[model samples]
Target: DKTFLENNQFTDEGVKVYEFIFGENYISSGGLEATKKILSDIELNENSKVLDIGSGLGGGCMYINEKYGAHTHGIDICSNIVNMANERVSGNNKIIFEANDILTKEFPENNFDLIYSRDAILHLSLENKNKLFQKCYKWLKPTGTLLITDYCATEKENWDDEFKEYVKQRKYTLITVEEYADILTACNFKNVVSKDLSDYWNQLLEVEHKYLHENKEEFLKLFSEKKFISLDDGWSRKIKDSKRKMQRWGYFKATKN
Candidate 1:
């Protein structure tokens, strides 16, 4: 895990590619639009305590705090990313970003009003995923909510070669959206809702593709033709994979009742 984590270059410039695709301050599937939509149903006041798992670049934290005036704490494993996030929100004391392992991290039970994560949970193994949810259930207040969007997939036995290779290369352990919702239910979470968002994800991918195609010269100037091609190809494959049900997008929302 350390080796795989260290090899990633999440520097300012390196993250620009993601920002280009996902909008500024986001590294997940959806940009600001999706962030606003996800949190729309969740009501929070200024005093609410929010714990953001896998908070990358502090986009969610910033937006959450802005909308609700809540104190948002973000925990991520990558110190580099956290440092950059810290730099971005230096004066915003309510938004705190730290580097910590979610599986081993300690927080008091019923400590948060909400637990949020983007597409970052796919890094955990199946066992770890359940363990993480258990931790979330403990961390949230009695009336709190848990929200997440992640990469899901078809059953392992049903994967095609391309999909298998993609999962292997990315080291992702993905389950069906049904299984995901089931896990939440097993965790004793109430109002568990898991939606297959692959169709919506495909829309974002196509928009990104169109943007990349339209601004090839600008992207090439900022980075390189090779980098542009790499991103383009990756998005192309994701679009195709999502359409084929080989890969899927998951949106999960559950309340700790």
Candidate 2:
């Protein structure tokens, strides 16, 4: 896992860097806005239990706890990321964030009303992805919802050299939207639905890009010029790739029987 640790840009400083662009308490795209959109149709109550995979900075968990009053448990593989998330929580027992791998974490069967994740599963290998979904199936209550937004891409054969290199450098395992949905169906999730949301992703990226440039002076105060360039270029590539349908954002929703 050295590569994971070394390549991960979610260290304490890195997390802060992302939060600056993603907004406070968030380290993912579109921040709270995206979370609301993803969870708009899901029903949960005060008694509901939710397991948030790859939960960064605890924003999703906090929101779920506030909106539905559900007990939201968030888990992320990065300890530094979890530490930062923990700092944001106060007197909220319903919202718990742990630094742990979901694949190894144990949850009783039929435990959760919602298993949610946001732009976090791309780190898993293909085999681990299947294993994790199987785990999600077991962890979910009957009729529980598994909702996720993740990075997806065109078929491997169609990937350009630059895209290929970017993927390799990031160590991301992105599949096509169709293949992503197929995995849920194979795991016995009923009524699995997946949508390609690259256009929406592009819009979010543009907005973020605009915001970053607009606040360059503020951002520079907290981060080095080099860090700014890296993030700026990174978002630029994502915007360009998504516009061409090379890089994609996938929205998936499935229910357990």
- Point to the candidate with the largest lDDT: 2
Tens digits of lDDT, candidate 2, 1-257? 42365257666787888899888899888998888888888889999999999889999999899899999999998887888889999898898999887889999999999999898899899999999999999999996999999999999999998899999988899999999999999999998989999999999999999999999999999999999999999999999999999999999999997
Compared with the true structure, the alpha-carbon lDDT of candidate 2 equals: 0.90
lDDT of 1 by residue, 116-141 (tens): 99998898999999999999999999
Which candidate has the highest TM-score of all? 2
Task: Report, for every candidate in turn, its global Cα lDDT versus the true structure.
Answer: 0.88, 0.90
Taking all chains together, each candidate's TM-score versus the true structure is 0.96, 0.97
Please count the clashing residue pairs in each candidate, in the order shown: 0, 0
Model 1, global lDDT: 0.88
| CA shift of 219, model 2, Å | 0.7
